[PDB]
Design a protein around this ligand. Structure first.
Ligand SMILES: CCCCCCCCCCCCCCCCCC(=O)OC[C@H](COP(=O)([O-])OCC(O)COP(=O)([O-])OC[C@@H](COC(=O)CCCCCCCCCCCCCCCCC)OC(=O)CCCCCCCCCCCCCCCCC)OC(=O)CCCCCCCCCCCCCCCCC
Ligand SMILES: CCCCCCCCCCCCCCCCCC(=O)OC[C@H](COP(=O)([O-])OCC(O)COP(=O)([O-])OC[C@@H](COC(=O)CCCCCCCCCCCCCCCCC)OC(=O)CCCCCCCCCCCCCCCCC)OC(=O)CCCCCCCCCCCCCCCCC
Ligand SMILES: CCCCCCCCCCCCCCCCCC(=O)OC[C@H](COP(=O)(O)OCCN)OC(=O)CCCCCCCCCCCCCCCCC
Ligand SMILES: CCCCCCCCCCCCCCCCCC(=O)OC[C@H](COP(=O)(O)OCCN)OC(=O)CCCCCCCCCCCCCCCCC
Ligand SMILES: CCCCCCCCCCCCCCCCCC(=O)OC[C@H](COP(=O)(O)OCCN)OC(=O)CCCCCCCCCCCCCCCCC
Ligand SMILES: CCCCCCCCCCCCCCCCCC(=O)OC[C@H](COP(=O)(O)OCCN)OC(=O)CCCCCCCCCCCCCCCCC
Ligand code: HEC
Ligand code: HEM
Ligand code: HEM
Lengths: 237, 379, 65, 55, 56, 74
């Protein structure tokens, strides 16, 4: 069992938010590398507005895809440009076509992949960057790839990321580790899209507790001082 | 003329329960966890009802309904993880509350102690059936293991498990009826808590000395309303630290995966507040003996008044029994840790020794040690 | 284009935990290849080496990314 | 009496703030959720519809 | 003293005590949210959408 | 059970102060710290040893369990 290391993410800190430029670059990584085999059923285009894209940019990104739309007057199903309210396209009509396309393996939905793994984005980063040669004595069937971080160390996913696998709009070199960090930030947002709000609320709650708890403690002790300074005398006959 | 607080029939009940109730002047912070429990209950009813405004118990939509609650419902992630970590806080407060009852001999209040045992069972059933509702991998397979445990029952085990399922396995009917029971049960818990307080107020609270405190009673309202408010604020602090800084600390990542009856998780554990029992049942090789031990580990709370062999009520003046009490708490911690672990060497022998030790403490060591303490005090 | 991860991995491989684990791994590699038919496998040795290397790399990598 | 009562006033003020937030959030969860605001809200478009055309 | 004046003017009567609490709750919500938000956006400066939106 | 009919008590005098005449945190540190230390020495050998035993048992079980997943040359 090779457990993932702890990487110093920008969002690891207690009040530390996600870097939203990394979320944007990570959407570009998902939408250009992962999406051909992974779905994100619970993330729609509208969700990316005010997070890593403007509404106009996200409407054009939805326009880039075609989505099936419900029955016509004649009763046929048609293809229409995507919309903000549309969820991310699914690469495969059903799980069986997904398994057929990927040598029997179903590639998981990535809406909750960070939350649904022990080790989270650390695990995903180490998995994406951790493809090595199989060690002496280890042989994998064809269509399987040695990854020391995958349970069993035999994964059906070929190494997806590499240097210059995509181009980044802000011009970053797209080194493999850069691409992995960006996509892992995006996956952390896709699992927990309340992360930044949750931590801002946590900061406010810590301030409010640091005010109220001393104050309620003073209220309790003001009322109780009557009992706590009380003196008793016994004067029997 | 009258004081309507004392004369009005409803306000008279309220006045006698929380305002003019004579309370011991020395009950410690450990006596706060009653008021925390009733607060947790209210919180669970409040957030759950708001979850039930969006949740749907069909297996095709339950996991999706919860994702919708946490992603699109306004502040639905707040309500959801407040509910989950409030279940965890409920059980923390329950364990501390029962530990206080054990340590101070509060079980000598027979009726309220026995109602408390009933309450413990009902809260456990509610939490168990609620955890299935998200229909994650852990939801499904924990329901599977825990319900198929009941097949160990002689002659009617399979029939009763299938009747609880409403089918050949844990499936759609089980999820919908678990939602219905999970909705209704906390209100029965509310009624039982009211009966519980009715039985408690017959004598009033016990105190840390274990000595009757009637010569030093203070009114409940100004003192313990403010003290219980401070305790509630501290509890809220811990709960909100969980909800806002580590939402997933006490949960399991595999419940963010939708239930897969074809694939089972490598580890199928209950929630943390079941692990001590899951250890005990897993310690015994026999299916039915294991289930009987997992039930006796909570039914044995009914035996404490009959096991009391000390001349004193509480543990305040009995060092040897304090030693045994803290050994009992340590054994419960090790049972929780063992239940979170695989059934393999060395956790098996450790779980066996811990499971033996729990019963050997409650049933044997604690009585004999109280008798020894009795003689050391020459009575 | 060069990746930070490559140079970070080499520098962290220069770590004595890595230096010890690497030759433990190469003694496993010398056995399992000499023995014609066995059940071992050097995955445990590689796991020790990778644990050390990746702890150091997780300390130093995000500074260049 | 001022100092002591000041402590109560501030405490109430803090509690008020907290109470409001909690209630507000429970009220907004019964408000139209994000997806409802997304789909049923609007269907705007440009003059793409030609003359005499009932799209 | 200042606290004697505050008590005599605003705390002695419960209605005026409550009015002071209400006005203070309004102004406290405003100022506390402003300060807490500024702290959160300073800790996370440049990382948030608001800081970077003006490029898109 | 109501105030006024709880027990018989005799010859006991109590003296109390108004909360507005006294402080809510008098000698909170100069007296509170020695009291916490006294209350800690009073109970520490009754509470601590079971948790030390749990720490040792947990440490041993975890390290041993992980010592079984290691390859033994054979
Ligand atoms: C200094 C050394 C380290 C800290 C103290 C260590 C220790 O064992 O202190 C026991 C010592 C209590 O001994 P005791 O007086 O025999 O216990 C009476 C009860 O604890 C009841 O006493 P109380 O009602 O005044 O409230 C104290 C109580 C409060 O407990 C709670 O509020 C519940 C905590 C669990 C949830 O907590 C404790 O006594 C245990 C520590 C709880 C976590 C901190 O703790 C204190 O003196 C109070 C806390 C001081 C913290 C500093
Ligand atoms: C799940 C958990 C859910 C939450 C559980 C809440 C339990 C109840 C908490 C509220 C409550 O009623 O507390 C009463 C309890 C006793 O009230 P008190 O008027 O301070 O009692 C003083 C004693 O008579 C005699 O006190 P002393 O003279 O031995 O020590 C005075 C002072 C001295 O402490 C220091 O000087 C600290 C120096 C460092 O330390 C304290 O008063 C401890 C307060 C903080 C602990 O207050 C606390 O324990 C406050 C903190 C409560 C949170 C748990 C801490 C353990
Ligand atoms: C119960 C009392 C708990 C103690 C008080 C904690 C108060 C913390 C607080 O209210 O922080 C503000 C936060 C909302 O923060 P935010 O979404 O930024 O809105 C600020 C106003 N515009 O609001 C919150 O964090 C509220 C968290 C608690 C909600 C449930 C309370 C019990 C029901
Ligand atoms: C848990 C808490 C439950 C609620 C507490 C129930 C008991 C108190 C509420 C009733 C109350 O305070 O009545 C007092 C008063 C009636 O007149 P008064 O002469 O002041 O009092 C005679 C009866 N106590 O009431 C009034 O005069 C009310 C004045 C209008 C409201 C402000
Ligand atoms: C708790 C950690 C602090 C601790 O152990 O403090 C010891 C202290 C002693 O309290 P006292 O009532 O004076 O007992 C006589 C002491 N010579 O306080 C105590 O011993 C009180 C602790 C026992 C009663 C309160 C509830 C404790 C629950 C512990 C976890 C229970 C888990 C479930 C057990 C069933
Ligand atoms: C740790 C326990 C205290 C928590 C933090 C303080 C909460 C508010 C209490 C307060 O107003 O004052 C606390 C301290 C001592 O105040 P106290 O002893 O209550 O009264 C002195 C004046 N008569 O006085 C002060 O801190 C300054 C008050 C002005
Ligand atoms: C052409 C195929 C393909 C591409 C490209 C691909 N994947 Fe996958 N992925 C799979 C398959 C097949 C599996 C199932 C694993 C086996 O077992 C998988 C599984 C995963 C898992 C789960 C591993 C686990 O622990 O269960 C993660 C996380 C993942 N992929 C992330 C990614 C990321 C991040 C990218 C790109 C930036 C990516 N994938 C690109 C096919 C692909
Ligand atoms: C639904 C959960 C429960 C609630 C809401 C609840 C509520 C309360 C409250 C408010 C008190 C008075 C305050 C106090 O002493 O703490 C109390 C006392 C008591 N409860 Fe509970 N309780 C619950 C569960 C239990 C359980 C599980 C037991 C144990 C089996 C139990 C046994 C007792 C006893 C013995 C007392 C009296 C303690 C004493 O005075 O020394 N209760 N309960
Ligand atoms: C005795 C009090 C209660 C306890 C201990 C309790 C416990 C739980 C737990 C542990 C869960 C699973 C949380 C998770 O997803 O991780 C849950 C889910 C749920 N509970 Fe409850 N519950 C209580 C009361 C209620 C009540 C009264 C309702 C309805 C009015 C309710 C409605 C729900 C709903 C709808 C869910 C599913 C949503 C979700 O998973 O978060 N609960 N409950």
């Amino acid at each position: 069992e090779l457990h993932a290391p702890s990487y110093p993410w920008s969002h690891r800190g207690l009040l530390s938010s996600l870097d939203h430029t990394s979320i944007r670059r990570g959407f570009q990584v998902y939408k250009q590398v992962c999406s051909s085999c992974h779905s994100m059923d619970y993330v729609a285009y509208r969700h990316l507005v005010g997070v890593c894209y403007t509404e106009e940019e996200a409407k054009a990104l939805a326009e880039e895809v075609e989505v099936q739309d419900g029955p016509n007057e004649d009763g046929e199903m048609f293809m229409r440009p995507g919309k903000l309210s549309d969820y991310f396209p699914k690469p495969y009509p059903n799980p069986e076509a997904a398994r057929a396309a990927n040598n029997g393996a179903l590639p998981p939905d990535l809406s909750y992949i960070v939350r649904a793994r022990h080790g989270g984005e650390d695990y995903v980063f180490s998995l994406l960057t951790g493809y090595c040669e199989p060690p002496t004595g280890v042989s994998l069937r064809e269509g399987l790839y040695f990854n020391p971080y995958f349970p069993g160390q035999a994964i059906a996913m070929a190494p997806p990321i590499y240097n210059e696998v995509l181009e980044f709009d802000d011009g970053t070199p797209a080194t493999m580790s850069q691409v992995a960090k960006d996509v892992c930030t995006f996956l952390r947002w896709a699992s927990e899209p309340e992360h930044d709000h949750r931590k801002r609320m946590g900061l406010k709650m810590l301030m409010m507790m640091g005010l109220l708890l001393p104050l309620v403690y003073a209220m309790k002790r003001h009322k109780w001082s009557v009992l706590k300074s009380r003196k008793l005398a016994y004067r029997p006959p | 003329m009258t004081n309507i607080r004392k004369s009005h029939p409803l306000m008279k009940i309220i006045n006698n329960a929380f305002i003019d109730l004579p309370a011991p002047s020395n009950i410690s912070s450990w006596w706060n966890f009653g008021s925390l429990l009733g607060i947790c209950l209210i919180l669970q009813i409040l957030t759950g009802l708001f979850l039930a405004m969006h949740y749907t118990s069909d297996t095709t939509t339950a996991f999706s309904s919860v994702t919708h609650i946490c992603r699109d419902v306004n502040y639905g992630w707040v309500i959801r993880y407040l509910h989950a970590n409030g279940a965890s806080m409920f059980f923390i407060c329950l364990f501390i509350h029962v530990g206080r009852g054990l340590y101070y001999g509060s079980y000598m209040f027979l009726e309220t102690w026995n109602i408390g045992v009933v309450l413990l069972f009902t809260v456990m059933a509610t939490a168990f059936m609620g955890y299935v509702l998200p229909w994650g991998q852990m939801s499904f397979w924990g329901a599977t293991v825990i319900t198929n445990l009941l097949s160990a029952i002689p002659y009617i085990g399979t029939d009763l498990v299938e009747w609880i399922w409403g089918g050949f396995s844990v499936d759609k009917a089980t999820l919908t009826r678990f939602f219905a029971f999970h909705f209704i049960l906390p209100f029965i818990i509310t009624a039982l808590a009211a009966v519980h307080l009715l039985f408690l107020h017959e004598t009033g609270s016990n105190n840390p000395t274990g000595i009757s405190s009637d010569m030093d009673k203070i009114p409940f309202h100004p003192y313990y309303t403010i003290k219980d408010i401070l305790g509630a604020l501290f509890m809220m602090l811990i709960l909100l630290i969980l909800v806002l800084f580590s939402p997933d600390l006490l949960g399991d990542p595999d419940n963010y995966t939708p239930a897969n009856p074809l694939n089972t998780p490598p580890h199928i554990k209950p929630e943390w507040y079941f692990l001590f029992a899951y250890a005990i049942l897993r310690s015994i090789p026999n299916k039915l003996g294991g289930v009987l031990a997992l039930v006796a580990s909570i039914l044995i709370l009914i035996l404490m008044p009959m096991l009391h062999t000390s001349k004193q009520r509480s543990m305040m003046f009995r060092p040897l029994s304090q030693c045994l009490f803290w050994m009992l708490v340590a054994d419960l911690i090790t049972l929780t840790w063992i239940g979170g672990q695989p059934v393999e060497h060395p956790f098996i022998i450790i779980g066996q020794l811990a499971s033996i030790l729990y019963f050997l403490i409650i049933l044997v060591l604690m009585p004999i040690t109280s008798i020894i303490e009795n003689n050391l005090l020459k009575w | 284009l060069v990746d930070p991860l490559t140079t970070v991995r080499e520098q962290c491989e220069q770590i004595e935990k890595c230096i010890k684990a690497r030759e433990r791994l190469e003694l496993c590699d010398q056995r399992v290849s000499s023995r014609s038919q066995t059940e071992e496998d050097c995955t445990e040795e590689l796991f020790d080496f990778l644990h050390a290397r990746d702890h150091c790399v997780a300390h130093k990598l995000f500074n260049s990314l | 009496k001022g100092f002591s009562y000041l402590i109560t006033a501030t405490t109430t003020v803090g509690v008020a703030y907290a109470a409001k937030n909690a209630v507000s959030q429970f009220v907004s969860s019964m408000s139209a959720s994000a997806d409802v605001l997304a789909m049923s809200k609007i269907e705007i478009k440009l003059s793409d519809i030609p003359e005499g055309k009932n799209m | 003293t200042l606290t004697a004046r505050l008590y005599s003017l605003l705390f002695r009567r419960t209605s005026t005590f409550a009015l002071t609490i209400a006005v203070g709750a309004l102004f406290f919500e405003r100022a506390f949210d402003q300060g807490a938000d500024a702290i959160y956006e300073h800790i996370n400066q440049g990382k948030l959408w608001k800081h970077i939106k003006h490029k898109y | 059970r109501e105030f006024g009919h709880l027990t018989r008590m005799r010859h006991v005098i109590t003296y109390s102060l108004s909360p507005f005449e006294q402080r809510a945190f008098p000698h909170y540190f100069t007296k509170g710290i020695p009291n916490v230390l006294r209350r800690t020495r009073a109970c520490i050998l009754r509470v601590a040893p079971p948790f030390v035993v749990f720490y040792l048992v947990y440490t041993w079980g975890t390290q041993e369990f992980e010592k079984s997943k290691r390859k033994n040359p054979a």
